[PDB]
Each structure stands twice: as structure tokens, then as C-alpha cells.
Write a protein that binds this DNA or RNA. Structure first.
Ligand SMILES: [Zn+2]
Ligand SMILES: [Zn+2]
Lengths: 197, 197
DNA sequence: CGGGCATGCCC
DNA sequence: CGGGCATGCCC
């Protein structure tokens, strides 16, 4: 069986979608999201808020898993891991894991025994009784350019909503560039899309 | 006592000097030496020949030690080591050592018990009975830019001629930039010296 | 090969 | 903060 997890969007019967905060115009804004490119540009180790939107209320015990995969065919079959430098200069998160969660008391970090892929899971909590979404705070512990890790290869983060029995209820994904200057780099990429895409 | 080794030139009673091969004009020549800057520009893990010149013949049992130090005050007191990536993706040389020697059957790699500095030592052999110098082949296992290692800080390589009793007979040093394009980068630096130095 | 993009950092 | 150098890599 394949060790490449699926990345296909499956908004599913709960109408699961992700949302992202608007950000300021700064060259080096800490986290910014491009809707045109479905891509988050963010700094390493800094907070990246991701909203979970649903139309119907998931069952008790639903879980939210995040996993990184390389976006291009060239590396899709390789596990995305933290580079040796940021592993050394590393809480609960194992030091080889790229994605950490902040702000949650029931995070689990998983290393798949068969595929060796890392993921990090938190309980699904429904929005607070006005809010329309639930926010989870992720961090990415390397820049996309880290040699010996991502090494300039783009990743997708895949966010799956799973029930406690393991059924896939919903799946969404977004591309990530972890970088020193998220505002510069988002604008560059959007302009490249318009000119050459 | 100070854990910063001396870097002062001491050509000493044997008239010890270093020499370096001339190289071609290629942007990405593997090894090239600037006399104006007393600086070797070279690629990582590739052969860097360094000649030892003496006016008088060192005693039997003389040893040739090479050691890297950071050239600037900012890092001079820090030990120069291979970055975590090139340590992982690593023979006789310990994987934390930046400088390796090729082509010699009696290399010793040393980790100083007091200063924690690395060095690599080979027996001094007098030139073959026409030659005027003895060549040792070094390699540097990271680029000067490796994050988690040199991290763009310039190094000096200090080459000492020592007798078997430990007396310092001679000392010379040269700056090193380990880089993808030694020819480009040597020309850049020489031009910066002329314009702004 | 040499031109020119890349992208964390300038200090 | 935004301009612009850095430097391994383009694929
Ligand atoms: Zn890293
Ligand atoms: Zn290195």
C-alpha cells in the first residue's frame, strides 16, 4: 500500500473548510495567507493561526490532525522532517517534528510505525458559543529553505478531521512557505502568478 | 589561561612559509588562492593543496598541525566545528571535524581536552629530492555559509610546524572561504578590497 | 561554463 | 521598518 497520504480536498458531510486571518502589509509580517495561491507565508517557530470552519457539528471525540508533505512529485514520497540544525537547537514536540501546536493541553505527536510520517493531533472543539470557527495555533520549526530539511522544497500542510473510530470526516490542505520575509515573498509569488503563471 | 590559540605568523628558524597552486579563471574553480587577501577560496569536501616551504630541514619527528579559528573577535573564542547537517551526512575523521586530510597514512585527529578545539596532524616529510616543497591535501567539510556551523563567519586555518617534543618551530595562517563559486567570490572580494578597502 | 535568481541577513 | 546584499542553486 502507498505510504503517500492523500492530499485531495474532501470537505465532506460536515462542510469542513479552513480559514486564515488577514494580516498587515509589512515586508516581514509574521504570518500571512494568499487566497489566490492557497498558501501561508510565515516565519519559523512563530504562531500561525488556522481556523476550522464546519457547517454541521462533528461527533464527540473528533480529532484534528496536521501533517506536512512535500508538494512536488520529486519529494512527495519523502517524510518531511525538521533539519538537523533546528533538531539540535530544540517541550512535548519531538525534536525531529516540523509542526508543533501551541495553546492546547491534549496535543499528541505521532510517528507512524509504517510510513514514518510525523503528525500532530488535537481534539476538535466546537466554536465558543458565539464564534463561527475554532482556531488552532501551529508553528513550523524550520524555514522552507533549511538545508538538510525542506531545502527550498514547498510543503503542503494537510489538516484532517477524523472521528474517534478513525473515519475521515473532512480533509483540507494549504501550501506553506516558511521564510524570513512573508510579506515580501507572498507579494513576489502573487506577482509571478500574474506575469508567468 | 587562554583557550584562543595564537594566530600570529612565526616563520621561525626554519624559514617556514606556505605556498598555494595557481588556478584557472573559472567561476566555480574548485580551489583558488588570493595573495592580496591571503585567502583560499574553495568548494566543500574538495581537495585544497597547501605547500609547506622551509629554508632549513626540520628535525626528525616534526609534525604539521592544521586548526581552524574564527577570524573575527565576535566568534574567535568559539570552536569551529562542522554543522549538524554535514556531521549527519558524514572514514577516520570524526564527523564533527571541519578539516580532513587526504592522501596520508598517519593522520591524527585531535579534540583538545581543555579547549575542545579540533585539529588534524600529519608527519612533516621533507620534499622529494628535487621538489622545493611538501604538499598536504586538506578538505573543508562545510561551506563558510553553513547554518549551525560557520554560518557565514570567516575562518583562518592555522598551520603549525611542531617538533616531536612540542616546540613550536613555525606558524602560518590563511583565511578560508568555502563556497560554491570560488572564482566568482575571490574576484568579488579582490574588487571590494580595491574599491572600499 | 557563466548569467542570474534566491532568501536569510545586514551589524 | 523597507532597501538591498548574499550565495547556493537554477532543473
Ligand atoms: Zn531548520
Ligand atoms: Zn555544513
Amino acid at each position: 500500500s502507498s505510504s503517500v497520504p492523500s492530499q485531495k480536498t474532501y470537505q465532506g458531510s460536515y462542510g469542513f473548510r479552513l480559514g486564515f486571518l488577514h494580516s498587515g502589509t509589512a515586508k516581514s509580517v509574521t504570518c500571512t495567507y494568499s487566497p489566490a495561491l492557497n498558501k501561508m507565508f510565515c516565519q519559523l517557530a512563530k504562531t500561525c493561526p488556522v481556523q476550522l470552519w464546519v457547517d454541521s457539528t462533528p461527533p464527540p471525540g473528533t480529532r484534528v490532525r496536521a501533517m506536512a508533505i512535500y508538494k512536488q512529485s520529486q519529494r512527495m514520497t519523502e517524510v518531511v522532517r525538521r533539519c538537523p540544525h533546528h533538531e539540535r537547537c530544540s517541550g512535548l514536540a519531538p525534536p525531529q517534528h516540523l509542526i508543533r501546536v501551541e495553546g492546547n493541553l491534549r496535543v499528541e505527536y505521532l510517528d507512524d510505525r509504517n510510513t514514518f510520517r510525523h503528525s500532530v493531533v488535537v481534539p476538535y472543539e466546537p466554536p465558543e458559543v458565539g464564534s463561527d470557527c475554532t482556531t488552532i495555533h501551529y508553528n513550523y520549526m524550520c524555514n522552507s529553505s533549511c538545508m538538510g530539511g525542506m531545502n527550498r522544497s514547498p510543503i503542503l500542510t494537510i489538516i484532517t478531521l477524523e472521528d474517534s473510530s478513525g473515519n475521515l470526516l473532512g480533509r483540507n490542505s494549504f501550501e506553506v512557505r516558511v521564510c524570513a520575509c512573508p510579506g515580501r515573498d507572498r507579494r513576489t509569488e502573487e506577482e509571478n502568478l500574474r506575469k508567468k503563471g
